[PDB]
Structures are given as C-alpha cells and as structure tokens.
Design a protein around this nucleic acid. Structure first.
Lengths: 125, 63, 57, 534, 148, 113
RNA sequence: AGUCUUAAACACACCGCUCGUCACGUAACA
RNA sequence: UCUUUGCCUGGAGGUUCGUACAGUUGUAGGUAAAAGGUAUGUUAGAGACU
RNA sequence: GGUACGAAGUCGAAACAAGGUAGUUGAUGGUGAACCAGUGGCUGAACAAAAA
C-alpha cells in the first residue's frame, strides 16, 4: 500500500517525458484505469521499475492536481448513498477499490456497491 | 413494472493486465443477476448479514 | 470543457446542449457537389434506390 | 584528413545511434509486450502497432485489430488512423500456412466432406478486415517497414493511403504453395498497369525499392522517421477545418527517384501473358524459346522465355489454373462496367490522379466520386468470388496437403524442405469453382438450392446461427458513437422514435459473439479432441 | 592548454535535427506565399549592431527613446504592430523581454547552442527557422538569398 | 499623436508607451488601495505615494499593475499603465459554468471561489 | 578635507540609545 | 508523495533510610508590542585613496 | 529576603562600534551599584594575514 502513494510524486512533473516507478502488483492495475480516461500516454514494466510516459497539451500537462485520500495508516470508506454527496458537480476522477476489482467512481454508483476511495485525479476542493 | 436492460458481453481481447481482466469478467456476471433477483424483507436476515452483503455484492434494482 | 475533452477523448458534454463540441457531421462527404453532366454515369454503377426510411426528403 | 574528403565520417553522427524498434517500447495496458495489437493514447491521432513473435496473423490478431480500428474510426477527434509494425525485417504474414494445414486434414477426413464451423469462421473474418480498410471514411496511412512474404500485403495495398520506402519488399508466390490468394489480393493485382499481376503471381517475381511505388502498388514514399514526429505536433490539427487537415499531412511525402527495372520488359509481359487460357500461353512461351536468336533484341528475349518456363514447371498445375481464372474474371468486369458509361481514354487518366491529390474545384471534386464508385463495386465482386473458390478447393483438391507441410517444415531449415510431385495436369471447365452457394430450407421446387450447388459439399448445421447464408455480404456498420442517456440518443442519426434506442439489441447481440476469441477457443479445442481421439 | 572540468554527458539537440529541417522550411514557405499575395505588405528585419555584413539605415520607424527613470521593462517596439506585419528577428536572446506580448508574427532564427541553453526563446518565436552552420547570422542569410 | 473619441470630442494621447491597436474605450479600472511610504535623506524625510490599479476587460481578460509616483493622483495613472502592458488571457468556459472549485495561496492567504 | 568598503540594539539618527545600588508611595501571592 | 518517535503555543512572574526518597511550565498584582529580516540614511579614537 | 506598578532624587558609565582594551554561557571565588579573576565550549568574532 505504501508503494501506491509513491506514484504521485513521479507522475506529477512538468519538465519531463518519462519517469520511473517501483514495481508493484497494485500499481499495475491503477495505470490501466488512468490510460482508459486518456491521462497516461503509456507505461512499460522495466523489471524492478516501471517506466511511465507523461502526456502534455499546449505545454501544460494533462494532470494538474493529485490528492491522496487513502493512506497506509487508515482506511476511508463511503456508502453508495454517501459517495454521491462527496462527488457532485465536478469532473474529477476518483479511484474506487471494490470487491470486484478496481473501477472508477462513476461505475461504483452504477453497481451500488460500497467501494473505497484511494486517490483523486483532476480534483479541486 | 420493471425494465431489465441487456448487458454486453465482455471483450475477450482486453488490453488490460491479467489481474484486472479476470476481475472485470467476473463483475459482469454479478450485474446481470443484480437486476433479476428481488431482495426479501429486511426482517428476514440479521443486521450483520446486510452489512456484509452490501460490501460483497452489488445492490439489486428491485428492492 | 474544450480543454479536457481534447485530451480526455471522452464524453465531456453539458446538460442543456446535446453533443455540441464532439458532433462533427461530415460536411465534405455527404453534401458533396454533383453536376448533371456526370450524374447519368453513376446511376448504372451505384446501388439502385430500394429503401423506406425517409419521409421528409 | 579533411571534412570534404570522400571517406569522411563524423564521430558525433555514430554516437547518437538509436534502435527504431525500441521506439515503440511503450504501449497500451499490460507491461508484458505480448498482445497482437497495441495502441498509444494520442491527441487527434490513433496509433496501432502490430507486434507478434513471427508476424503470424491468426484469428487472435484479427479480433483485436477490428476492435481498435472501429473504436478509433468512430471517434470524431481522430481525423485519421496510422498503421505500422514492430517485427524486424518482417511484416504481416497474412494467415500463415500452419493454420491452413489443420483445416485441410479435418475437412477431408469425413466421407461427406462437410466443412466444419471452425474452417468457415476464420475465412469469413479475413474478408471483414479487408473491406474496412478500403471503405475507411478517414485517411489510413501505413508504411511497410519490413519485408512481406506470401499474401500479406492486403493491409497496405487496400489502404486509403499506402506508402513504401527503400526498406520494403513485395513477395507473392501462391502457386508454389498451391493456395489461392486470400484477403482480397486479386483486386490490387487486377488493377495494376497492364497484365503485371498475372506475371507477378504465376512466376512470383520479387520487387523492392522504388519499383513498388512506380508499379502502382503504393502511392506514397513517406520515410519511417516521419511517424514519430506526427505524435509531437498533433495538437494543432483540430484547430484547422477538415479540408485543411489533409493539406498539412502532404508535407511529409517525399519525391520518387528515377529507377525502374521493368522499363523495357513491360511490353513483353503484356504481349505474352494475354491468352484467356492457361494452356494457350504455354505454347507462346515455348515458341519464343525455340525462336532463332538474332540481333541484340532477340538474344534477351530468347533467354527470358527459357528461364521463365523453368519456374512454372516446379509448381502445381491445378493451382495456377484457379488463380488465373479468378484474376482475369474480375479484370474483364472493369472493361465493361466503365465502357458502358461512355468514358474515353483521356477522361480516365484524369480520374486516376484524383486519388493522389485532394480536389479543391467543383470539377475536380466530382471526378473523385467516379473513382470511389467503381472501386467499391470491384472489391465486392472480387471478395465474393474469392471465398467461393477457397471453400471448394479445400474440399476437392487433395494435393494441397503435401504443399502445406513441405513449406511449413522448410521454414526451420532447408534440409526438411521437399518438393512434392503435385499432380498431372488435366482439363477443367474453370466454371465450377465460381458457382453461387446458398443454405435455404425451401425445396418444394425439386431441390431449388439444395445447399452449395446441386450436389456440392455441404456445411455443418451449427453454421446456421451466426451466418444465415454462406455468401459474403456487407453489414451496415454505424458511423457515430452510441450513448445511454436519453438526451444524447436524440442526436445520433440512426435513432428511431418508435423505440427510443439508437441500436437493435437483437442485431448487436450476434455481432459481439462473432468477434470473441474466448468463444472461438472452446469451439476449436472441442474439434481438436475429436480429431485426435477419433 | 585547459585546466577546467571535462564534461561527460553529451546532450542531443532534436529541434535542429537534419530531418526536422525538412518540415520547417515547407511550413514556413506556405505562410510567406499567402502573405505576399495580399497588397500593401511590409516586413521588419531586426538585427544586431555587431552584424556589419548587413547594411542598416539611419532612422528606424517605431523606435521609442525612454529614460532610466520609470523604465520597468518598457516595451520599445510597442507601436510596431500598425505599419508592419512581419518581423524577422536575428537575435532572439537579446530581444526576449520586448517580444513577449507582441501582436505580430516573429520569424526568429536562433542556433542550437542558444536554444538548449535559453529555451525561453521558444515561447516568443512563432515560426522557427533553422540556421545551417549556426555561427553568425550576418553572413548566414546572405548565402541563402544569393544561392546559385 | 492623438485619437478622436467622437461622443466626447477631445484630444487624447495615443501611444505614450501604449499599444494603439488595443481599444481604450472597452476596458475598466478599479482602485484597490493607495499606500504611502517613507524615505530618509541627509536633511529630513521624503514621502512618495503608490497605488495598485487592476485593469482588464470584463469578458475574458484580467490584469494587475503596480507603480510609484510623487502624488496620489500621479501614482494612480502610473499604476494603471503597468496593468495594460501585463494583460493575460484566462481559460473560461463558454457556458459560464466552472468545472471544479479552485483554491489559492501565497503565505497565510486563502481565496476559495 | 571629499569619496569608496564593512559593522550597527540609533532613524525627533551620538546633545542618540540603555543598565544597576540606595530613598519615598500603592498592592497580590501572607 | 508515504511510515513511526519526541517537543511548543504573544512577551512576562511567585514567603522569611523522615533537614530523607519521589515529583514540578501552568489556579496571580500587572501589559499591548516583543521580534526575524531587504533597502535607505546617519555614526563610528574601523580599512584604503584623488 | 525576593517580585509588580506609578512618580522621581542621588551615586556610577555596564551593553552598542576593537575605546569598559571580545563577550555570552556551565560550575566556583570575590566585590556598596555596571558585575570582575581563572578553566571548558560556542560565534551571536573584530584587526592582521604566503609563490621558486
């Protein structure tokens, strides 16, 4: 779980093209969801470290703000009816860790199952 | 009256990693039965049972 | 919206309008010009018109 | 030493060497690079890299390729899709011979010669991808960075915008393996200048370099170094209008050098390869070989006839008849479909140039429509007849089994390659291999259809679920993305008000099942166990 | 002789790559061809004093003389977007603070050495033009304009 | 070196270190504060005023300028000059609807919109 | 004598600034 | 970007094994500015020169 | 004995800047009041300061 929070520092760079990241089982699954939304150009497992590319548009990067909700020292859980109040009138991306794999916040409400808020992408206050 | 919507078949050539592909395939079947299995009265089962089910299975569409 | 949609390549539409920035009708393929001098040549080569899906045409 | 000396090399130039293959290290989800198809998230561009162990294009690769092509084409942001490969000195092999060996023994094992469901499932898939690239609504840029072996150029020749370079080759020798060209390869060969395709197919002459673009196969000479640069300046393509986008892409095309090996030999091929019958041209070549060699011109012609005959004598006589009959059949159609309209030689030349440049005037724009209309009809006929001869040959020709094994075993080492005897030449009607076939139950008219032909091979009952008819038809694929919200469905063109949906659930249910590798594996495995056990 | 530190890492320059120059000229030619077609078009050739090979006039239109008092990054070519329509700067490094918010296209011609060391010039320059041999712009443009 | 202003009809300085292309009849100014400073010399004390005037179009433009002057009236005019020369574009939605709420900081401050 | 460099707890700027013992008066912890 | 230990809340103040062991910032009479610092000026029995 | 506040007189020139001949600190000695002598540590340290 500790290695998951170490990906925000590397992926949050302006003047860079590719950054390394420690190899982890959970980290690989997270990158898949981000690529679908069009946030990561691509990634490759280089053995002990994973090389992840950075996407840019008109100079500025596609990622501008990263918020870590879940931490190794504690665990944030929200009911299906409570996640909607938290996440409303926004374009942000919340990573939800449900029993049936990992999915975004939009899919969590559709199934109505209780997920787990891991991190936030392109989120304001 | 209810209106069950059809669910598309999962794609076999999924580009995701093997760990995520297996989870996604299983989750598709759960959604199909979620909307076709009305739940019983709350009083049937214990309180404890309800809490575990909410965090293990999706929510039915016919309460 | 115009910023996120360009990079997000996903539905980033509002609630009131419907598909204003993403909808790009092919205005250079369907409304292509056609002259009466070359129309007779394409009648015998194209599929004959046998359909019923348009009344206001 | 001096900078102006002939044998001068800059030390800095050799220090910045890079591997072109390593440029595609990053790909889509999945750290282990083993997927048959890859994709890179770009802005206004769709990347597609074909990576495989040996460039074997099996059913697994087609399933992924069709999904990515449709997903990118429907997206309005992606104004064009680029295709490329990743193998070293290789390209898409196009259904290698290893897959065909299993389909032959299994089909010929039974006495009734009933084609299994697996055999037809794979063949029909090859036609869908071939038609999509030709009928693409957006530009399709592709480059042949590797060498092509056998019938594997269908993914570049049929593309809307084909390109080539020095590191490219063209090889097509179907007669050696005793197989009919698949993936609609006859359409390109019959559209070449003169009877060039006939000579390139029967003899299997290899071509590489600028000759490919000059012959007529390709139409561009873009360098490989251009593809990576397109991914860096793709954000400025959406600002301009649709017409202005194509103009910018023209800055990457270079000029062609003055070089051609068949400059003077083209006239000989047309003069010789002109008889409608295979047996007739045999005497023509033999007569030239015995011709009295005189002067300078006669010496070159005498040797040409003697060398070409040696190659045709080491192939399958039956295979050569099938390919020649089909290639010439579609070719003769162009001489009648276009002549009946009342077109002249001068007018046709201008229409051909419409594909090499974007029209701007009203007069120029109209000419492009004529080329698109005839091209769409020719490909449909070529593909329809190609499938008819493929199924009958596998169920009747018995010599095809030896050829498949000889080439498959010879790939590992030449020592394992053996030349089979094929079979003695025999006269044929060259009409039974192009007969229509249907599967219809009504038979109150004294066996009106009775399966394929009146007494031809029949199909398995299980093939009546996905494909109601064995003929290759065209499906009305949509051109806009779908949606679930009621507000968005009203914007889709194909949205009927009698149901509130933009698609037919019944029709789409079968489409997804067809393009499914998981379902195909179970069906293929069941057939293999039955063959091995009994 | 030299007693300083010897560098080890060699940085590569992709902006002035030999292949990249192919598209640079092709794209630049299209812009100039369309501009010259219109009537009443004037250009500006801004250089440096060290450029002796390039002749210069006495007076320069649009030049503003200011004093040291209250001169917090004053824009010299503020009024140079009325009479002119295209400026071809030869020393982007020196003319970097004035062309930050200029309302005219800047056809700067820099060198790989300055671009790598001073990337800030990329934002002010709109159309980038290569410079073979990258030594002195005074004798560089003369050869191009006197080819054959 | 003058520009007409047809409904007022009076001479106005055109250039004066200002871009003439930009219309001056479409922008607005808002006085923030007029601070005062102190300077020491060999004889006594010297005071010079200052002001911070923000100039920007109310459609898609914004800008802040700062300068100094001997008197409050002169300081205001000088401060406005810098705002014009430092005009920057914003990324605003067509629909007049933001996506997410932004937050801002410099030392103790917080400006939540 | 006029400048330059450095230091400063002063800037009504060295007639600056500031501390301690003792003497008298008013109070809370006694 | 993440794990764990320790510590502080303006400045400021206290009676006039048994005399051993352990333990301590805090229940006031009073006050509204103590203080880090970029720059200018001034002073300097502190260094240099027209 | 010691401490707070108000007013304000006498006796001294400790801190500032090397004039008190550097000056705060841990533990002692001494002196009407600035505090002073010695050892340890620190700079919150001033002046001076290399070719064959």
């Amino acid at each position: 779980m500790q290695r998951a929070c170490e990906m925000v520092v590397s992926l949050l760079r302006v003047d860079a093209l590719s950054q390394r990241c420690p190899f982890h089982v959970l980290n690989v699954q997270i990158l898949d969801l981000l690529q679908r939304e069009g946030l990561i150009r691509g990634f490759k497992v280089d053995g002990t470290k994973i090389d992840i590319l950075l996407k840019h548009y008109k100079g500025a990067p596609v990622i501008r703000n990263i918020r870590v909700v879940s931490k190794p020292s504690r665990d944030i859980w929200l009911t299906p009816h409570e996640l909607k109040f938290r996440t409303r009138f926004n374009t942000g991306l919340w990573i939800m860790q449900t029993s049936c794999g990992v999915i975004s916040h939009r899919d969590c409400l559709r199934m109505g199952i209780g997920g787990k808020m891991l991190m936030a992408i392109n989120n304001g206050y | 009256p209810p209106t069950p919507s059809p669910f598309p078949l999962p794609p076999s050539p999924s580009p995701s990693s093997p760990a995520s592909a297996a989870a996604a395939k299983a989750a598709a079947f759960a959604e199909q039965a979620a909307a076709q299995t009305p739940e019983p009265s709350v009083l049937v089962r214990s309180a404890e049972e309800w809490i575990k089910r909410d965090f293990f299975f999706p929510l039915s569409h016919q309460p | 919206r115009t910023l996120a949609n360009a990079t997000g390549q996903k539905y980033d539409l509002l609630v009131a309008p419907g598909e204003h920035w993403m909808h790009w009708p092919d205005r250079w393929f369907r409304p292509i010009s056609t002259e009466y001098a070359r129309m007779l040549e394409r009648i015998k080569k194209k599929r004959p018109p046998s359909y019923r899906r348009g009344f206001r045409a | 030493f001096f900078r102006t000396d002939p044998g001068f090399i800059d030390p800095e130039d050799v220090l910045f060497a890079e591997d072109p293959v390593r440029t595609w290290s990053h790909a889509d989800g999945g750290g282990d690079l083993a997927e048959e198809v890859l994709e890179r998230s770009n802005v206004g561009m769709g990347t597609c890299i074909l990576n495989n162990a040996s460039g074997v294009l099996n059913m697994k690769g087609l399933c992924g390729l069709f999904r990515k092509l449709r997903d990118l084409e429907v997206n309005p942001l992606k104004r064009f899709v680029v295709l490329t490969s990743r193998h070293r000195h290789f390209f898409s092999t196009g259904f290698d011979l290893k897959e065909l060996l299993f389909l032959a023994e299994l089909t010929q094992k039974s006495t009734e010669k009933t084609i299994p469901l697996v055999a037809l499932w794979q063949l029909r898939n090859l036609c869908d991808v071939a038609y999509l690239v030709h009928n693409y609504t957006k530009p399709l840029i592709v480059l042949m960075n590797g060498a092509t072996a056998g019938s594997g150029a269908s993914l570049c020749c049929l593309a809307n915008r084909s390109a080539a370079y020095h590191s490219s080759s063209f090889t097509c020798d179907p007669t050696a393996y005793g197989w009919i060209p698949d993936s609609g390869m006859s359409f390109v060969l019959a559209n070449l200048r003169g009877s060039l395709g006939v000579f390139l197919a029967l003899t299997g002459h290899t071509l590489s370099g600028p000759d490919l673009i000059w012959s007529g196969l390709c139409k561009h000479w873009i360098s490989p170094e251009a593809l990576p640069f397109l991914e860096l300046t793709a954000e400025k393509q959406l600002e301009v209008s649709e017409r202005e986008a194509a103009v910018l892409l023209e800055e990457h095309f270079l000029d062609a050098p003055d070089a051609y090996s068949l400059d003077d030999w083209e006239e000989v091929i047309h003069e010789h390869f002109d008889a409608p019958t295979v047996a007739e041209v045999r005497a023509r070549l033999k007569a030239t070989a015995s011709r009295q060699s005189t002067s300078v011109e006669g010496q070159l012609h005498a040797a040409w006839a003697r060398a070409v005959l040696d190659r045709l004598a080491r192939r399958s006589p039956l295979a050569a008849d099938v390919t020649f009959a089909l290639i010439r059949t579609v070719q003769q159609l162009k001489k009648q479909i276009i002549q009946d309209a009342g077109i002249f030689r001068s007018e046709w030349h201008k229409i051909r140039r419409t594909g090499l440049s974007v029209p701007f005037t009203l007069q120029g724009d109209c000419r492009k429509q004529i080329l698109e209309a005839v091209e769409d009809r020719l490909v449909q006929e070529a593909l329809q007849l190609e499938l008819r001869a493929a199924l009958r040959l596998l169920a009747w020709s018995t010599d095809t089994i030896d050829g498949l094994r000889s080439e498959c075993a010879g790939r590992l080492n030449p020592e394992y390659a053996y030349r089979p005897q094929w079979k003695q030449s025999q006269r044929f009607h060259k009409e039974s291999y192009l007969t229509p076939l249907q599967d219809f139950f009504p038979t109150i008219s004294s066996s009106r259809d009775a399966a394929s032909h009146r007494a031809g091979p029949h199909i398995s009952p299980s093939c009546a679920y996905f494909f109601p008819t064995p003929e290759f038809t065209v499906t009305p694929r949509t051109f806009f993305p779908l949606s679930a919200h009621p507000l968005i469905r009203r914007i889709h063109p194909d949205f009927d008000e009698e149901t509130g949906n933009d698609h037919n659930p019944y029709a789409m249910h079968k489409l997804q099942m067809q393009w499914n590798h998981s379902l195909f594996i179970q069906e293929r495995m069941q057939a293999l166990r039955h063959f091995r056990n009994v | 002789m030299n007693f300083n530190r010897i560098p080890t890492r060699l940085s590569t320059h992709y902006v002035c790559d030999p292949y990249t120059t192919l598209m640079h000229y092709r794209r630049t030619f299209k812009f100039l061809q369309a501009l010259k077609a219109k009537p009443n078009c004037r250009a500006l050739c801004l250089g440096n004093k060290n450029q002796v090979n390039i002749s210069w006039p006495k007076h320069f239109d649009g030049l503003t003389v200011v004093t040291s008092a209250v001169a917090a990054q004053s824009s010299i070519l503020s009024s140079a977007s009325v009479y002119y329509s295209l400026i071809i700067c030869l020393d982007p490094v020196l003319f970097a603070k004035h062309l930050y918010r200029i309302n005219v296209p800047v056809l700067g011609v820099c060198t790989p050495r300055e671009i790598h060391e001073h990337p800030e010039i990329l934002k002010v320059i709109d159309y980038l033009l290569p410079a073979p041999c990258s030594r002195t712009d005074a004798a560089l443009r003369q050869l191009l304009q006197r080819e054959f | 070196q003058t520009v007409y202003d047809a409904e007022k009809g009076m001479f106005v300085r055109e250039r004066e270190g200002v871009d003439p292309l930009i219309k001056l009849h479409e922008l607005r100014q808002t006085l923030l504060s007029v601070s005062r400073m102190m300077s020491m010399n060999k004889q006594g004390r010297v005071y010079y005023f200052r002001a911070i005037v923000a100039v920007g179009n109310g459609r898609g433009l914004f800008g802040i300028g700062i300068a100094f002057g001997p008197s409050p009236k002169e300081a205001r005019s000088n401060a406005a000059l810098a705002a014009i020369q430092n005009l920057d574009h914003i990324d605003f939605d067509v629909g007049r609807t933001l996506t997410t709420p932004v937050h801002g900081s410099e030392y103790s401050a917080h400006v939540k919109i």
